[PDB]
Enzyme design. Sequence first.
Site, PDB file in Angstrom:
ATOM      1  N   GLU A   1      93.082  38.559  20.376  1.00 22.61           N
ATOM      2  CA  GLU A   1      93.317  37.368  21.007  1.00 22.61           C
ATOM      3  C   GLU A   1      93.919  36.283  19.751  1.00 22.61           C
ATOM      4  O   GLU A   1      94.751  36.121  20.600  1.00 22.61           O
ATOM      5  CB  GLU A   1      91.969  36.358  21.633  1.00 22.61           C
ATOM      6  CG  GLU A   1      91.946  36.810  22.125  1.00 22.61           C
ATOM      7  CD  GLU A   1      90.594  38.243  21.927  1.00 22.61           C
ATOM      8  OE1 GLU A   1      90.481  38.475  20.427  1.00 22.61           O
ATOM      9  OE2 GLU A   1      90.029  39.040  23.234  1.00 22.61           O
TER      10      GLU A   1
ATOM     11  N   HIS B   1      79.231  34.839  27.747  1.00 19.02           N
ATOM     12  CA  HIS B   1      80.124  35.576  29.014  1.00 19.02           C
ATOM     13  C   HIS B   1      80.245  34.160  30.121  1.00 19.02           C
ATOM     14  O   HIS B   1      80.321  34.393  31.111  1.00 19.02           O
ATOM     15  CB  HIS B   1      80.309  37.021  29.974  1.00 19.02           C
ATOM     16  CG  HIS B   1      80.128  37.690  28.806  1.00 19.02           C
ATOM     17  ND1 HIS B   1      79.071  38.766  28.414  1.00 19.02           N
ATOM     18  CD2 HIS B   1      81.370  38.177  28.682  1.00 19.02           C
ATOM     19  CE1 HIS B   1      79.691  39.056  27.391  1.00 19.02           C
ATOM     20  NE2 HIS B   1      81.064  39.819  27.419  1.00 19.02           N
TER      21      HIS B   1
HETATM   22  C1  LIG Z   1      86.250  39.191  20.729  1.00 23.08           C
HETATM   23  C2  LIG Z   1      86.402  40.224  22.242  1.00 23.08           C
HETATM   24  N1  LIG Z   1      87.595  40.102  23.111  1.00 23.08           N
HETATM   25  C3  LIG Z   1      87.288  40.730  24.485  1.00 23.08           C
HETATM   26  C4  LIG Z   1      85.704  41.366  24.698  1.00 23.08           C
HETATM   27  C5  LIG Z   1      85.771  41.640  26.551  1.00 23.08           C
HETATM   28  N2  LIG Z   1      85.347  43.462  25.605  1.00 23.08           N
HETATM   29  C6  LIG Z   1      84.072  43.469  26.301  1.00 23.08           C
HETATM   30  C7  LIG Z   1      83.073  42.363  26.515  1.00 23.08           C
HETATM   31  O1  LIG Z   1      83.063  41.638  26.887  1.00 23.08           O
HETATM   32  C8  LIG Z   1      82.172  43.881  25.855  1.00 23.08           C
HETATM   33  C9  LIG Z   1      80.312  42.683  26.277  1.00 23.08           C
HETATM   34  C10 LIG Z   1      80.512  43.459  27.530  1.00 23.08           C
HETATM   35  C11 LIG Z   1      79.011  43.566  25.294  1.00 23.08           C
HETATM   36  S1  LIG Z   1      84.461  45.184  26.054  1.00 23.08           S
HETATM   37  C12 LIG Z   1      86.007  45.312  25.304  1.00 23.08           C
HETATM   38  C13 LIG Z   1      86.936  47.027  25.268  1.00 23.08           C
HETATM   39  C14 LIG Z   1      86.424  46.723  23.985  1.00 23.08           C
HETATM   40  O2  LIG Z   1      86.483  48.731  23.506  1.00 23.08           O
HETATM   41  P1  LIG Z   1      86.246  49.211  22.128  1.00 23.08           P
HETATM   42  O3  LIG Z   1      87.417  50.690  22.671  1.00 23.08           O
HETATM   43  O4  LIG Z   1      86.058  48.514  21.142  1.00 23.08           O
HETATM   44  O5  LIG Z   1      85.150  50.469  22.970  1.00 23.08           O
HETATM   45  P2  LIG Z   1      84.586  50.699  23.601  1.00 23.08           P
HETATM   46  O6  LIG Z   1      85.697  52.285  24.257  1.00 23.08           O
HETATM   47  O7  LIG Z   1      83.088  51.546  22.829  1.00 23.08           O
HETATM   48  O8  LIG Z   1      83.623  49.908  25.415  1.00 23.08           O
HETATM   49  C15 LIG Z   1      86.769  43.835  25.495  1.00 23.08           C
HETATM   50  C16 LIG Z   1      87.529  43.957  26.156  1.00 23.08           C
HETATM   51  C17 LIG Z   1      84.947  40.711  23.911  1.00 23.08           C
HETATM   52  N3  LIG Z   1      83.652  41.869  23.278  1.00 23.08           N
HETATM   53  N4  LIG Z   1      84.986  40.018  22.774  1.00 23.08           N
HETATM   54 CL   LIG Z   2      81.283  38.090  34.415  1.00 18.31          CL
END
Ligand SMILES: Cc1ncc(C[n+]2c([C@H](O)CC(C)C)sc(CCOP(=O)(O)OP(=O)(O)O)c2C)c(N)n1
Ligand SMILES: [Cl-]
Lengths: 388, 388, 335, 335
Positions: D69, D139
């Site tokens: 971000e 969230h």
């Molecule tokens: C700082 C930040 N930015 C974006 C996200 C959104 N996001 C997620 C969630 O919000 C997870 C919760 C549901 C537990 S997971 C995610 C994808 C992360 O991908 P990785 O390859 O690190 O992990 P994996 O392939 O195992 O899901 C993002 C963009 C996040 N959680 N944190």
């Molecule tokens: Cl949501």
Amino acid sequence: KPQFPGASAEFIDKLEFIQPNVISGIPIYRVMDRQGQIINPSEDPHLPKEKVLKLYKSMTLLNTMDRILYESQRQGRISFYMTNYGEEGTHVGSAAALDNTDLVFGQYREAGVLMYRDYPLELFMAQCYGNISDLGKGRQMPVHYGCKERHFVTISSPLATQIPQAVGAAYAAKRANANRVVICYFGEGAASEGDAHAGFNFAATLECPIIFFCRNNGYAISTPTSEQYRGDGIAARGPGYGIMSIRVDGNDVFAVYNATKEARRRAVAENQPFLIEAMTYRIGHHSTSDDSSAYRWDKQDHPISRLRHYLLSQGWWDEEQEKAWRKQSRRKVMEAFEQAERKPKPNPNLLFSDVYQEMPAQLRKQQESLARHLQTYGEHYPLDHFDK
Amino acid sequence: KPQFPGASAEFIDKLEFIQPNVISGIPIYRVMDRQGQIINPSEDPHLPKEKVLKLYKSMTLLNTMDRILYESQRQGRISFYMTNYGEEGTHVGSAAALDNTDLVFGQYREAGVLMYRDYPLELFMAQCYGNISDLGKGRQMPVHYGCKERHFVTISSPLATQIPQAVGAAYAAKRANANRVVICYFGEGAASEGDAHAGFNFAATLECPIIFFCRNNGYAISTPTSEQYRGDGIAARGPGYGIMSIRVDGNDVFAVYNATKEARRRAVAENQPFLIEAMTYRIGHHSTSDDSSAYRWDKQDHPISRLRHYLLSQGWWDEEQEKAWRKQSRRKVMEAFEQAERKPKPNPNLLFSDVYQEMPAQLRKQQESLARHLQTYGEHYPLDHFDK
Amino acid sequence: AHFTFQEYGQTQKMNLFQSVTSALDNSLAKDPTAVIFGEDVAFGGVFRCTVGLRDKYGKDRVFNTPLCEQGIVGFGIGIAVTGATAIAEIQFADYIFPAFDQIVNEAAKYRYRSGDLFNCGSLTIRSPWGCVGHGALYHSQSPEAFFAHCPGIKVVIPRSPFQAKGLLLSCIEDKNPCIFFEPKILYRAAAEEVPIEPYNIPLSQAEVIQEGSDVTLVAWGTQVHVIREVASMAKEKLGVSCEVIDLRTIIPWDVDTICKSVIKTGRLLISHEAPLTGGFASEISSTVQEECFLNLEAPISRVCGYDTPFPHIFEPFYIPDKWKCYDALRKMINY
Amino acid sequence: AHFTFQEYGQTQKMNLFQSVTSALDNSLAKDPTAVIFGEDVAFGGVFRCTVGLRDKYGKDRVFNTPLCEQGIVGFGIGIAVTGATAIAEIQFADYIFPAFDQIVNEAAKYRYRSGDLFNCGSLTIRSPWGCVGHGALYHSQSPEAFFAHCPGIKVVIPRSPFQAKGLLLSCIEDKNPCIFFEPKILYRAAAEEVPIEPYNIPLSQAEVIQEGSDVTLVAWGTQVHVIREVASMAKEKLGVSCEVIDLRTIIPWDVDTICKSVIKTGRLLISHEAPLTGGFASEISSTVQEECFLNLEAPISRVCGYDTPFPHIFEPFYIPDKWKCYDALRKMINY
Ligand SMILES: Cc1ncc(C[n+]2c([C@H](O)CC(C)C)sc(CCOP(=O)(O)OP(=O)(O)O)c2C)c(N)n1
Ligand SMILES: [Cl-]
Ligand SMILES: Cc1ncc(C[n+]2c([C@H](O)CC(C)C)sc(CCOP(=O)(O)OP(=O)(O)O)c2C)c(N)n1
Ligand SMILES: [Cl-]
Ligand SMILES: [Cl-]
Ligand SMILES: [Cl-]
Ligand SMILES: [K+]
Ligand SMILES: [K+]
Ligand SMILES: [K+]
Ligand SMILES: [K+]
Ligand SMILES: [Mn+2]
Ligand SMILES: [Mn+2]
């Protein structure tokens, strides 16, 4: 064969950790030795006389200004200053390899780039004094220079924030079909910031015509590089992001020039980032707030000295010229200095404009409040120093 | 010889950019083939029968739980879920190589580490249901597990924030003279965050006994690795920070085990970080909020299948055992599930505690306000579901 | 200068930086787990706050980090998770922002979200704060209102050397993550007797430093000295008796002490160097109005920095100095 | 559900996500420099806000960034420095914090600190915001009060599909960096007629959506629907006439519209899902008290989220729902 989407590689059937090459790091590109002699004829850029004299006069004029403004700060005439001692070669060498309209983002210790781009002495001094001639309107601390005409984005104090910005500007240039590169200067300390990892990765994955230029001068204030990182400097990080990388002798104007010239040519043609790490040494204190003898080149490996030896070998400079220029540059700097000191500071009203493009009504209310305040209590303020 | 403090290197007299090796990346360590055969006898860890059966039963029990809880989410019984399909080998292989008290930090897709550490089915389900048995007091969304008894730091949603934390915990362990390592799991998407650059650099410069474990499963939600980075995956970044690095076949429990075992041994002895990038493939949707067919292993390269073939070759498993275990694990999971559904949710009072260790008077005021509110308006709230 | 600076065993004259060093020295002496780290702390810090500590306690306990604030705070959180005392430094409060996610999403929520299975209560983040005459946009800021909207952290700002050492020791020992902002203009300027041995001043407790009956004035940090002077101007020029209060802890703040004072005086003026809009004076003013509606004789006045970035050459015009405060007080008295 | 959702050429029924897509489509069609980027935006986004745009406009204009971000915002600032329109997405408002330094120290200050030699006025950051029934700590968040203390940015939050498209287009075209928070609970739930062609709703302008004479109720986002319902409950149960106002722009906010209403009614209740302490209701309440002291018949009420992190299983008890608002209103009417 491995099928994993995340990497392109073979299998190996034995456990082997990859060791970093830190003792035998990426070699340091050099063109001229400390006596100003060309080491390898095929690397000589053969810059014409007028250009090399401009590299030389820009460094020494910066050095002259540095000495005067550092003294001015000691005397309390300006609030702050940071010198460029030892790093003048990185500034001018790289600036000379850029096209005039290539956009520059910096850190704070790159004033030679502006000097090479003919930024007036009057405006360097206007910013440091915060006087009415400052286009920055006296709002930032000294050495926070910016010039829209010369494509040099206003310096800000937060370290490394300009790195991902420079990348966004480079993406926009690509789109515009610019034949323009962006260069982004930063120190080895600033390279530790999370914004550096963001900028390097975005530049590679979004394919941007940017040169990252790291001035590695051995210290971040009091912190030596042994406490800053443990891999082989900044240059060794580039390949991990997919960025073409090189390390240069930052005290060698021609090495800096050659690397910057080739990076520019290739970054613009190929829409790919290049990383240049220029090895130098911060000869000065960190700033006027720093006494560097609390925690730790000038005579045996200085960019200016090396360049001066080169001019002599071509027969392009002599003692007489050196003396006349020393005098002329002192006079030029002292003239701007005296003018800068006699100018008033800007109208205190300027405290309120440019916060937003327009002035919100509630902000105008605050401006009116100050105007009323000063009408009643004005004797208690330094009004006679400020315009209007 | 170069004298610069920032790097240890020779001079070079010709201009050469360092190119990244992305097409020929760091090779992928493998121990067993997709038919569960050992490729190189000298790499075989010869884990004893009971341990290998525990690796196998932990993966399949996780898989059983995943299927049930994913269905529960589809039916609206729990609000959210994320499965671990395809990555079960990375969890159990690495957890088995750790000492029981090594401290684990994770991301969200590492539940097999807890399962291997004998975390009760009842508590996995208590967290997902937010019921009275949840030691997290129903406060976080499902799959945000934590267990102080089993040294598994509570998961949080912000990506990569645990990376520099894990490093601080590792520094503290060093100081304590722990003979303890910290392991820090994260995905290849999370590795793009600035916190990853912070953690990697701090670990090297502060000399911390930490294993960084990156699960590279090809996607971060919809984003393929071609849009995530341009160098050779995460493993190639390690050397730039001075970190010993390796890449493993994440679908091979024994490759994961061997790399993790050797990293642990060396990280603890030498106070130095190790980076392991495990190549896998995310077989499932990203989460229950994701339909992965919008933007893009199961039958030909699955960690569970590979492990099952290995057991058969030693004569350690057969069809009868597989059937009995399939049934026993279904029953165990269904028992915990039914219990989890019949438990009440925690007292709504628990909404206010643990914000600070103590409860500030002004926070107690808000708690009292809710109690008064519910006395008057309680019919409008789901009270019959909540304890007390 | 826009301001003038004016039981516990043996004391020594100490300026504010020295009182910080004394607090840190006392902390490391009594708590073998405690460590101090951040940018340039090893040689004694850019404001001399850590001079001599590495020599005394060792390089493993007083050390430099790489230049990365998000790393500094995440690192300190992880030390504190193990139970060890982590005293992080952020070189200027202006540069705390890169760590904002680690502070707000992580440190503040760590205990709540784990149901108290884990915490980072033994973290303290200290950072120079507030105007300094010529700091301009990024060596002048007062970010306390950003943090005040984050349940789970404590935010503490002292006004003097004696107050700084007792409040810092309380933060270090408090079982919650604390941000301790040190008013950098006072590092050398303010000097007074400070106990050599450790002592504590309570958090979430305001201090009435001068009793008065006509108006209540509230500030924190250097601005306490500004309002003390304003009280003197008001007494001399207007025959107005001012009750002067140092808030000390921004959150959780001492609502009771402030309301008790306003119930007595009927008038309130709050002042801070931070910008007006969204500044912490708005929280105090709303709350007081809610609790003291029947007692309030005049609208509550906030005399704050303007809603601009903090300027270089215009600093003398930007700050809520004694004349701006006095004039606002005059008008409110006239109401 | 804790809420119920209730000139310009041809219109179509659109839910909130579709109205966002319509605004974005209109923007890219008319501004060849405009680009949209962030995490997972290329396939249409995790809330479908960008579906079809990459196909229509090309992969160079609608694209995925790496997962970072601080990189997203710094990147968008640099595009906007060149004069190009940069529409950044932050996947959830909870994850805006890593970019806090780029927003507050950089974007907000860019024009001021360069004396208008450079700016990033053509940056807009859009991000889903607010509670969603089960989002829990990360969230669910409503971070607008953190940003309200930062001069130099604008912060805008719509309450419906029609409002969202007109406000987003205004943000995109406004010559200042803007954060546009989209109430994610409304993405599918709220649906109404929305003009197909572009139109603008002014920034820094509140909207009185129901005239009343006894009390003024102010909210923004989804909470507008909560207070609309509260107005109905108050009319039916108490014979109380409520003036219902949607603030729309958090900063710079429409002080005049709010004060004009309170001068008429004499009572004010402000509600928001964000925590009470340091929440933006404190700024509105302080200011109104300063401007409407003589008209205020009762203390100003703030009905907000509790000063805790946003919980998972306790969400129904955490939010300032219609009953909490009504009860507070009842008491204030009784005052
Ligand atoms: C700082 C930040 N930015 C974006 C996200 C959104 N996001 C997620 C969630 O919000 C997870 C919760 C549901 C537990 S997971 C995610 C994808 C992360 O991908 P990785 O390859 O690190 O992990 P994996 O392939 O195992 O899901 C993002 C963009 C996040 N959680 N944190
Ligand atoms: Cl949501
Ligand atoms: C995010 C952040 N953290 C810390 C600093 C403090 N700091 C500085 C200033 O505040 C600069 C202003 C006076 C213009 S400079 C600085 C050292 C930076 O060292 P580098 O090696 O990057 O650069 P150099 O050696 O050329 O000074 C730090 C820690 C800073 N400016 N930004
Ligand atoms: Cl005076
Ligand atoms: Cl109901
Ligand atoms: Cl300073
Ligand atoms: K900068
Ligand atoms: K996390
Ligand atoms: K503490
Ligand atoms: K804009
Ligand atoms: Mn340096
Ligand atoms: Mn992934």
